């Protein structure tokens, strides 16, 4: 995917830095991260590629591993960031409202104002399942037993 895509040129041309390569983030849940973090002493993939590991416990992302590029050194409104979170200050409004026409309650409401935007059309998506049937069971000797007449 790094070869087939033009991602290497995109960062070199857009960043203005003749020597610039993307860094990949390993986006995982907690179970998967426990395995990728094993030896984070030197996080490289190929000759020059580097990566970092970020994890969440959000149920929506349970069992998913997604690898995305990012600029190695983040700046401000960095277009080379895989996505961006455009945040406007949240407002907390406090006003006594006769809600429903018969009851009077003070309602303090926090009104969000923000957008997530995706920039880079790159993703590697991995569905990883079956840790318990590999680390909690025989994977080799059990198979040899199955070959028994």
């Amino acid at each position: 995917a790094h070869r087939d895509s033009n991602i290497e040129a995109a960062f070199r041309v857009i960043s203005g830095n003749q020597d610039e390569t993307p860094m990949y983030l390993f986006c995982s849940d907690k179970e998967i991260a426990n395995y990728l973090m094993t030896k984070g002493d030197d996080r490289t993939l190929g000759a020059y590629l580097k990566y970092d590991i970020v994890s969440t416990n959000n149920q929506l992302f349970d069992g998913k591993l997604v690898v995305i590029p990012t600029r190695a050194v983040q700046q401000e409104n960095d277009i080379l960031s895989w996505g961006q979170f455009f945040y406007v200050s949240t407002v907390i409004a406090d006003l006594p409202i006769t809600r429903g026409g018969h009851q009077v309650t003070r309602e303090i409401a926090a009104i969000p104002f923000n957008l997530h935007v995706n920039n880079i059309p790159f993703a590697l998506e991995f569905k990883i399942t079956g840790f318990q049937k590999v680390m909690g069971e025989t994977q080799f000797n059990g198979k040899l037993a199955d070959l028994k007449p």
Partner: protein
Amino acid sequence: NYNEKSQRDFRVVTIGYNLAASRQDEFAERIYPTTVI
């Protein structure tokens, strides 16, 4: 206009665009070293 929420003015970011190439890429240069004629 009960809600004069911004619709026209936005922040603008200019995306960089800097093309470069050497007389030959390192790949082409090692295979076909340059000789000045």
